[PDB]
């Protein structure tokens, strides 16, 4: 047995390695803390084939997409163990009724300022530009933060009223997507104004900013608790405080809760359980990681009660209280691409903020209408009857793509019925992981091949043959998770092709 733990390079990995070394001394078992590049991207590729780490570490927002793929194993955390962590932290790691990952710590962006340069932090975002005038006079910069990640810019975009998905009575509504509304256009406009008014360069990354503030070159930065240790080490006189206001209202950061999930493919499930509950999630386990790089408002009540007495944590918690817990819906991986692209094209000057935000909002519309078209076809091909409920935006286009899918998709199923049958029988998809396995196989078979409407219809028709065969054994709960993945490989990995082919209109045009 062994334990391979993947965790982001910005988190305390040497501290976690000390926790695994402490576990190593009591079990023999080697714990290996690797911190790979583009972790949120690499984990899904490897763990789909069943080649990942035993324990994965990321903010909860990506775990809901991992669970739909079946890249995660369900955790069995005893009734007594759950009472040791905060109820809201367990809620962040709950997907479709099931706890999929372990809550570690609540993370939220706070404003970090140098007390020597600024005796006080500015109450508003609108007073940061004129501060730069008086700070440049002394050879300095007023504010520098990561402009590459939309996580760092979201609190300004969300302050006046921008949002990912609205929380309609215990659920997210993918029809109500506010990345285009006036509050987002106003927030992002102020950021673009700072680059137009030379107050900020539209190329500052995590390292540029961490160097600048910690060297004493910039007056304030934006960051999470993980960055505290490097400021502490730089000996800079700093204060962590509430984020400034935009247009009178607070900056609402997206609030992530660092989670610890176990690969479903992994053969060290019970080993990861003892490691996570009995070793890591204890005051001494979290104090070891926290000593390397601060976690934030930790899930563990025992250690959080102590940690609460730190005004840096109180600022973090007040900022978390003024922001929102990020959704864990599968669309989130795709949502972030759309939004990173928008923040990067607005700052880079490649686009107007109305355009950059539109192509981003449009990206969610392609995801919604696509999940609607695909799932409708697939569900009606198992029941044998149409759904009569409305579809919203681009309704007549989605209506025609369905009557186009029924004609062309049933032609593919008919003309290739002999072949589809052999493929479905040569797989023995009996249980849910076997079905989710297929989801990934067709996802990568289509992708590692040419992108055209022919192959799209083929991939969807096979999905409808599968939806018919799922129904046969009553475990037809995988139809929508299958329909949402075919949407993902399409609007996520082939976004540009679909947009170049005039969306679903080009498909209805294609076959006539
Ligand atoms: O910026 C988009 C990005 O935001 C979040 O990632 C944060 C993460 O939560 C922090 O712990 C830290 O690692 O910084 C990241 C931003 O660089 C989402 O979790 C992530 O999925 C998303 O792509």
Residue numbers in the entry: -191 to 320
Question: From the publication, what sentences describe this entry?
Answer:
The prosurvival protein MCL-1 prevents apoptosis by binding to the pro-death BCL-2 family proteins. The process of intrinsic apoptosis is governed by the B-cell lymphoma 2 (BCL-2) family of proteins, where dynamic binding interactions between pro-death (e.g., BIM, BAX, BAK, NOXA) and prosurvival factors (e.g., BCL-2, BCL-XL, MCL-1) ultimately dictate if a cell will undergo programmed cell death. MCL-1 is a prosurvival protein that mediates malignant cell survival across multiple tumor histologies. The large, hydrophobic, shallow binding groove of MCL-1 has presented substantial challenges for identifying effective small-molecule inhibitors of this protein.
Extensive investigation culminated in the replacement of the nitrogen tether with a carbocyclic linker, incorporation of a symmetric hexa-substituted phenyl core, and extension of the pendant methoxy of compound 2 to provide the highly potent and selective MCL-1 inhibitor ABBV-467. This molecule possessed the physicochemical and pharmacokinetic properties consistent with the desired profile of a short-lived IV-administered compound. Herein we describe the generation and characterization of the highly potent and selective macrocyclic molecule ABBV-467. The macrocyclic core structure of ABBV-467 serves to orient the molecule into a highly active conformation; this is evidenced by the reported target affinity and potency against MCL-1-dependent cell lines, as well as the durable in vivo efficacy observed following compound administration. ABBV-467 is a potent binder of human MCL-1 (dissociation constant [Ki] values < 0.010 nM) and demonstrates lesser affinity (Ki values > 200 nM) toward the other BCL-2 family members BCL-XL, BCL-2, BCL-W, and BCL2-A1. Consistent with published reports of MCL-1 inhibitors, ABBV-467 is highly selective for the target protein. ABBV-467 has substantially reduced affinity for the murine mcl1 as reported for other inhibitors, while high affinity (Ki <100 pM) was observed to rat, canine and monkey MCL-1. Treatment of H929 cells with ABBV-467 induced the classical hallmarks of apoptosis, including a dose-dependent loss in mitochondrial membrane potential, caspase-3/7 activation, and phosphatidyl serine externalization. Moreover, deletion of the BCL-2 effector gene BAK in MCL-1-dependent SKBR3 or SU-DH-1 cells completely inhibited the activity of ABBV-467. In summary, the molecule ABBV-467 is a highly potent and selective MCL-1 inhibitor that demonstrates robust inhibition of tumor growth in in vivo models of hematological malignancies.
